[PDB]
């Protein structure tokens, strides 16, 4: 009796930095996923545990829609079993992930001529993220024994790095918007369903 509000995730004016990735919960609604898997707008559309051409045949207890910006060369880390700067320190999918990863080039929206320094990723971290963990700390990173006391310096590094997206960069260094759909089929009743 409700349409799922997927547009406010996919079509939003601005996307989050991956270190601060957004999450919207989708529940008690219906969606025609045909508009999704019949779109040519997508450079990545990989599903795990479900077949993309079958999402209209399944119901789920809960759907989460996570979204962020990375560069093209990093979209391969948004998958189960992957390591790297994004999967280790920014956005991590579990090994038993059931859902879809959707990505598209956003150079025209997220690049700027002087460089867009508003999109950031975490470069320093003492340990890897657990699945679906979000780390928004901007504490100076202590890379030695001496504490940093909020001051950058030797062995004292700002932990985030700006992508500096520029429209003239190569494709793998251009911004890509990503939406991760997590389908949860638990013991609760079936709320998020598909239709024609």
């Amino acid at each position, epitope marked *: *009796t409700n*349409l*799922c*509000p997927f547009g406010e995730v996919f*079509n*939003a004016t601005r996307f989050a930095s991956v270190y601060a990735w957004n999450r919207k919960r989708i529940s008690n609604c219906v969606a025609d996923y045909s*508009v999704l898997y019949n779109s040519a707008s997508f450079s990545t559309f990989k599903c795990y545990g479900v077949s993309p051409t079958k999402l209209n045949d399944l119901c789920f207890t809960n759907v989460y829609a996570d979204s962020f910006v990375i560069r093209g060369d990093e979209v391969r880390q948004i998958a189960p079993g992957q390591t790297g700067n994004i999967a280790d320190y920014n956005y991590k999918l579990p090994d038993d992930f059931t859902g879809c990863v959707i990505a598209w080039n956003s150079n025209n929206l997220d690049s700027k001529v002087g460089g867009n320094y508003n999109y950031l990723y975490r470069l320093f971290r003492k340990s890897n993220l657990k699945p679906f963990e979000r780390d928004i700390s901007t504490e100076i990173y202590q890379a030695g024994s001496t504490p940093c006391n909020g001051v950058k310096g030797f062995n004292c590094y700002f932990p985030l790095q700006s992508y500096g997206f520029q429209p003239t960069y190569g494709v793998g260094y251009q911004p890509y918007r990503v939406v991760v759909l997590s389908f949860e089929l638990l013991h609760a009743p079936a709320t998020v369903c598909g239709k024609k």
Partner: antibody
Amino acid sequence: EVQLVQSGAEVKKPGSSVKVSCKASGGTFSSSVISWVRQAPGQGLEWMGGIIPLFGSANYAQKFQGRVTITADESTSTAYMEMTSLRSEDTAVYYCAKVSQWALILFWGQGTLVTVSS
Amino acid sequence: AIRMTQSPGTLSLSPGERATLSCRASQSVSSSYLAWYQQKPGQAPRLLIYGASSRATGIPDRFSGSGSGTDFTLTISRLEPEDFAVYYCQQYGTSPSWTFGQGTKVEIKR
């Protein structure tokens, strides 16, 4: 991609009815909110009502609840606005406007002029 | 129901000036579902802004939308002579229940 094409202009006498169509192309019809908007000459835009063709339960602005029937046909991707007991005050351009559940943009038809005159 | 009141009803400015148009909602409204339209006499409304801040195709970047909750704004950073027109705001959503603001006219000051 998506395109909304409304039926042509109408001249109707007081007391008659009018049924305006809006044919959608693009495959976003069923999972969309399809609304009808009126603009009387010299006046602003007024939302009349809308429907989701997946559920078929139309919802109307209070000002239009009696004389307007909004229907949608999934088999032909065509939405309809029927207004009964027309009066001169119903002279306006009627627009169909559409929102897909998958985007925040709105798609509009070109407008249909309805002139109520004997 | 939700009521969108625009202010001012008439904006009287010279070309080159900055225009700030307001849209106030009787309740809090999601910023994802707020739109702005431009209409010129004898013409159909033209979508300018959707999702509070996204520009539709062909819209110059002197048009910017902002706001959240109950207060939304359309800014025109430097009026060109083509920018003098009537502007409507619109609350919408994924339910069939939408409302338009009553209109702000941007006219030449004299």
